[PDB]
């Protein structure tokens, strides 16, 4: 996260750090005690193997995510229409081997419902352990920052992303830059508060540089993916 501030315990209780062989690689969002929403570009082969992945919840600093303190991932499911060249349909699910214990530090975020009626420039938050500057290293501490939705018509303009934003994508940030997700925030949450509920509206997908003018962040459009998410959860439960 570029241009944000370190988070307090319990501020973003759905945020998880997803490790490959005990090294942070991607972020994710808790939606049930066993299901985590992340990005498909985090889990392309050979990272489609659940054996490599562990999830760390309720911990703010990477130095406190030890071997054995994290939850082993049991299943990894990428969107069947994910396209690696364009990152279209960039969403994936991880199922934990053992359910999480919810408390003050670990809680789920709500999946969006149809008919949220969000504002064109709805105020949102992003969080993660991504770099705090372009080309920087992973952040030891969880950071978070405010961003606004940017209408896809504006994001697809010639001087922004020039028709690269599909219906499975949403844009958020600032066309002036300064605040943005960055390397290491992949898969993490883009959330918004409405009716006193925090809703998961995006997962960190791609961007051109970090916090540069007219190059805002692009996020998987979680609302579009909800039917697929429910189907995977339903197929797992029985």
């Amino acid at each position, epitope marked *: 996260i570029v241009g944000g501030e370190s988070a307090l315990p319990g501020a973003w209780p759905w945020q998880v750090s997803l490790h490959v062989q005990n090294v942070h690689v991607c972020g994710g969002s808790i939606i049930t005690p066993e299901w985590i929403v992340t990005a498909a570009h985090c889990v392309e082969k050979p990272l489609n193997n659940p054996w*490599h992945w562990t999830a760390f919840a309720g911990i703010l600093r990477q130095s406190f995510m030890f071997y054995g303190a994290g939850y082993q991932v049991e299943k990894v499911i990428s969107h069947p229409n994910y396209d*690696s060249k364009t990152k279209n349909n960039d969403i994936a699910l991880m199922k934990l081997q053992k359910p999480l214990t919810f408390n003050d530090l670990v809680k789920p975020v709500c999946l969006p419902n149809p008919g949220m009626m969000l504002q064109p420039e709805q105020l949102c938050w992003i969080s993660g352990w991504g770099a705090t500057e372009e080309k920087g290293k992973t952040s030891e501490v969880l950071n978070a920052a405010k961003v606004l939705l940017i209408e896809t018509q504006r994001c697809n303009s010639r001087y922004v992303y020039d028709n690269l934003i599909t219906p499975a994508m949403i844009c958020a940030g600032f066309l002036q830059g300064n605040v943005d997700s960055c390397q290491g925030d992949s898969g993490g949450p883009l959330v918004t508060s409405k009716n006193n509920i925090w809703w998961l509206i995006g997962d960190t997908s791609w961007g051109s540089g970090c916090a540069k003018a007219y190059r805002p962040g692009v996020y998987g459009n979680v609302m579009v993916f909800t039917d697929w998410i429910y189907r995977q959860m339903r197929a797992d439960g029985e």
Partner: nanobody
Amino acid sequence: VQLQASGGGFVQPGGSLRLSCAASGKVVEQGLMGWFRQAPGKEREFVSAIQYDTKLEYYADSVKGRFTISRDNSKNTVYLQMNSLRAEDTATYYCATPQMWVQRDVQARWYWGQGTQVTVSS
């Protein structure tokens, strides 16, 4: 973790090369090491990967059978033996860890030291 690739060169169809990736940093960061390749004007491609204890190896379909990946943990070095090379294997080959290859911005450049050029022409 710092990675220095080497071993690239020019060969003809049927030839062989053995690439090396020397790692400097905490061994915890080397749990999974991978090789990727990129030819000009084309998308980056996964090639092979190996677990630190060598008990799991991965290969892309297009190189399965011809390439072999190995480690020497006291040197902290990963090797990629490539046999029976074709012209379509021509690319710059990169070694990387998962924290490097999984990219929010895929068009962001990888460090020069991670790569080594391989050209296959007769």
